[PDB]
């Protein structure tokens, strides 16, 4: 791609393709800022009746989602018109946006949806679904305008464009137990659980209240609804933060749940509940083919291994995306798409059963990281992140590499290669933590580069990080750094085929002086191939005072 390969077309507003008249904002990587927290670090700002912003589809579409800001506590709608003609208007709102801290407290993003004295708003925009009664061709103008009775203003990021299918029918009535009007979930569970001829349960197009977790359990269990943009379960949308959805037992190992939408209703981030799925230690299931937003994550994985999670759609969460964690080992999680996760959106935590192995995270786009990083690997052994497109964070790596433990049981990496192969990210890192008493002190916190490389209290080893594009990072591109005082020899780091263009600060940084009480590096890492151009300072900040840590440039290198 890189990344996923997916149905829809994400157009920016802001390209220079798309007249407007409106205000097309300029970018920046300022976290609660319009832009800063913008596709692309920036929107078109429609704040006048006849405002607009004009797409040209490239391919067809008869669906489409528009991803915008608008103000605080405020529902409303704005208009879509296909060659002039209007066609219809977005249902846009803020309830799932604005989530409030302050700069020194960024540590409660996500967790406060309240106003208050002296706080700042963050996460400012959300997503409006919409379908229409025709596929229109490429080539369409697609125009988004602000007519009479819509909103007072809107800002206009981006604009997914599908084409999507009809709905699709029961598979087949005698194996399948449909939902309907006055058969529910669990009612249909139950009919499948006692009669051994069927597969599992059918959900037709509509919406379906899920006010609670639905167990599965009994045996292998296939759920099936018409397609994600027509089958929606929805929780309780007149309560808020309600821990709804599937949970899957031992004796339901083996299920899927495929083609299908969940609709949650939280509006921030809670430490436990949350997860649309639990599974813990599940195995052999798939999840295919669904979208999922307003849930603090899809799945938690704990010790959950030979599971299959493909061409699903997590967007708009409370906290990560997809994580497996604790002994989760031989996962396929291959071509999904991310976009506003509330913290790493697809993630890997290593922990003891020695380590996290054979798992392949492959085909993934995440976008929009409102905190944490894009990916994020924490140990491990014998693990790949193969095709990865991450763009946008607002605080943290496009890719965070640690062997930090967290204060959990871990032995950190192990001794096959942890690989990142084939990954473009655009508009990666940020600033979180403190730097009292840093080296290289440019503000507040402390300064993350597009990878980030963290030798912490347990083993750094064995890493290759290769074919990478890394486009106009917040700061740096390669960011290595270890602990003190526990100072763990990185060994086996080795960067190939890696172009870092623009950076703002230096291509390369081995942190000296973190904050006060570290030290720098320990160690080394090779670099084949590695090119970087135009960095704002210089190439490499931090070689002559890392006496502990040694740069190998094999070839290739113009630094
Ligand atoms: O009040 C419930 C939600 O209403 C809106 O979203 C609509 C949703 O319920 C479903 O029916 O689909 C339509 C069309 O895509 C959605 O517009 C609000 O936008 C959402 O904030 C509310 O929770
Ligand atoms: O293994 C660590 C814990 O993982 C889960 O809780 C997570 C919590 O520590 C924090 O990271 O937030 C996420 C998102 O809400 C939580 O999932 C388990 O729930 C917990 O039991 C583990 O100790
Ligand atoms: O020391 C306890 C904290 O460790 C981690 O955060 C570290 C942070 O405190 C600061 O020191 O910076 C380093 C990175 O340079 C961070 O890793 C944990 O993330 C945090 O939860 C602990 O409280
Ligand atoms: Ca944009």
Same mark, same amino acid.
């Given at each position: ?223 099936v609804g018409a397609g994600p943009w027509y089958t929606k379960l929805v929780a309780p949308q007149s309560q808020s933060n309600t821990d709804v959805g599937f949970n899957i037992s031992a004796a339901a190992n ?85 976009? &506003?996760? +509330? *913290? ?6 290593? /922990? =003891?059963?020695?380590?996290?192995? #054979?798992?392949?995270? !492959? ?48 032995? &950190?990496? +192990? *001794? ?6 084939? /990954? =473009?990210?655009?508009?990666?890192? #940020?600033?979180?933590? !403190? ?10 916190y402390q300064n993350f580069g597009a990878i980030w490389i963290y030798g912490g209290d347990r083993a750094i080893k064995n890493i290759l990080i290769k074919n990478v594009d890394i486009n106009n990072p917040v ?85």
């Amino acid at each position: 791609g890189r990344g996923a390969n997916m149905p829809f077309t994400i157009m920016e507003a802001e390209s220079t393709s798309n007249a407007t008249n409106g205000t097309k904002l300029t970018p920046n990587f300022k976290p609660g800022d319009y832009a800063g927290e913008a596709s692309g670090r920036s929107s078109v700002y429609l704040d006048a009746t006849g405002e607009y912003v004009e797409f040209t589809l490239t391919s067809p579409a008869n669906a489409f989602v528009l991803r915008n800001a608008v103000a605080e506590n405020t529902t409303g709608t704005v208009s879509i018109y296909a060659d002039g003609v209007s066609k219809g208007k977005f249902n846009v709102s803020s309830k799932f946006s604005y989530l409030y801290a302050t700069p020194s407290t960024l540590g409660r993003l996500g967790y406060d949806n309240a106003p208050g004295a002296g706080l700042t708003a963050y996460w400012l925009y959300e997503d409006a679904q919409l379908m229409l009664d025709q596929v229109y061709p490429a080539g369409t103008k697609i125009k988004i305008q602000k007519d009479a009775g819509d909103v007072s203003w809107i800002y206009v990021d981006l604009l997914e464009t599908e084409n999507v299918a009809p709905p699709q029918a029961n598979p087949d009535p005698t194996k399948y137990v449909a939902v309907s009007a006055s058969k529910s979930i669990d009612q249909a569970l139950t009919e499948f659980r006692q009669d051994n001829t069927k597969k599992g349960i059918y959900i037709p197009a509509g919406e379906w209240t899920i006010n609670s977790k639905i167990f599965l359990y009994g045996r292998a269990t296939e759920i099936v609804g018409a397609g994600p943009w027509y089958t929606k379960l929805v929780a309780p949308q007149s309560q808020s933060n309600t821990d709804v959805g599937f949970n899957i037992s031992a004796a339901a190992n083996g299920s899927t749940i495929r083609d299908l939408s969940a609709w949650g209703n939280y509006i921030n981030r809670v430490d436990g509940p949350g997860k649309f799925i639990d599974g813990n230690g599940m195995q052999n299931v798939t999840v295919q083919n669904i979208w999922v937003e307003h849930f603090v994550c899809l799945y938690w994985g704990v010790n959950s291994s030979y599971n299959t999670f493909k061409n699903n759609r997590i967007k708009n969460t409370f906290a990560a995306g997809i994580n497996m964690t604790n002994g989760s080992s031989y996962n396929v999680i291959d071509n999904n798409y991310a976009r &506003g996760t +509330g *913290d790493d959106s697809f993630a890997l935590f290593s /922990a =003891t059963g020695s380590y996290n192995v #054979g798992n392949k995270y !492959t085909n993934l786009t995440a976008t929009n990281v409102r905190r944490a990083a894009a990916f994020a690997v924490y140990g491990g052994s014998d693990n790949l992140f193969q095709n990865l497109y991450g763009a946008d964070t607002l605080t943290y790596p496009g890719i965070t590499i640690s062997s930090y433990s967290f204060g959990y049981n871990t032995l &950190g990496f +192990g *001794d096959q290669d942890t690989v990142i192969d084939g /990954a =473009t990210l655009d508009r990666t890192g #940020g600033d979180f933590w !403190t730097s009292v008493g840093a080296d290289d002190k440019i503000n507040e916190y402390q300064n993350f580069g597009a990878i980030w490389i963290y030798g912490g209290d347990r083993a750094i080893k064995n890493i290759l990080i290769k074919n990478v594009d890394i486009n106009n990072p917040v700061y740096f591109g390669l960011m290595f750094q270890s602990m003190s005082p526990n100072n763990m020899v990185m060994q086996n780091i080795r960067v190939e085929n890696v172009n870092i263009n623009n950076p703002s600060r230096y291509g390369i940084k081995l942190v000296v002086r973190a904050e006060q009480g570290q030290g720098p590096a320990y160690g080394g890492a090779s670099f084949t191939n590695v090119k970087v151009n135009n960095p704002g300072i210089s190439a490499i900040y931090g070689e002559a005072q890392s006496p502990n840590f040694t740069v190998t440039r094999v070839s290739g290198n113009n630094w």
